[PDB]
């Protein structure tokens, strides 16, 4: 698998924009599924509680990010 899904269930990251997010490693947000819509994420895209994040990167950082976010 190369596309992983992570739930954004951490209140500490609400309204935090991708351009300021402190990534656990080399990761790109491929899509964010929010309110039944699939968004192509960019720098000023803000995380929201309940977001379904579709991410790609090495399993390590993905796992790392997963722990912090959900």
Ligand X SMILES: Nc1ncnc2c1ncn2[C@@H]1O[C@@H]2COP(=O)(O)O[C@H]3[C@@H](O)[C@H](n4cnc5c(N)ncnc54)O[C@@H]3COP(=O)(O)O[C@H]2[C@H]1O
Residue 20 DSSP symbol: T
Query: Pick from a second copy, ligand X, none: which does 38 bind, CB < 5 to 8 A by kind?
Result: a second copy
Tell whether the torsion through CA atoms of 6, 3, 40 and 44 is positive or negative: positive
CB 27 within 8 A of CB 37: no
Note whether 9 binds a second copy by CB under 8 A. no
- If the CB atoms of residues 62 and 69 are measured against a second copy, the closer one turns out to be 62
Scan residues 2-61 and list those touching ligand X (CB under 6 A). Answer: 18-19, 28-29, 41-44
Q: Are 7 and 66 in contact (CB under 8 A)?
A: no
- Footprint of a second copy on this chain (CB under 8 A)? 1-3, 26-31, 38, 40-42, 54, 56-58
């Amino acid at each position: 698998t190369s596309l992983y899904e992570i739930q954004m269930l951490n209140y500490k990251y609400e309204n935090i924009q991708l351009r300021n997010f402190p990534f656990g490693g080399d990761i790109i947000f491929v899509r964010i599924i929010r309110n039944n819509e699939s968004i192509v994420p960019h720098g000023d895209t803000q995380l929201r509680y309940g977001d379904r994040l579709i991410v790609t990167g090495a399993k390590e950082y993905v796992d790392e990010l997963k722990q912090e976010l959900e």
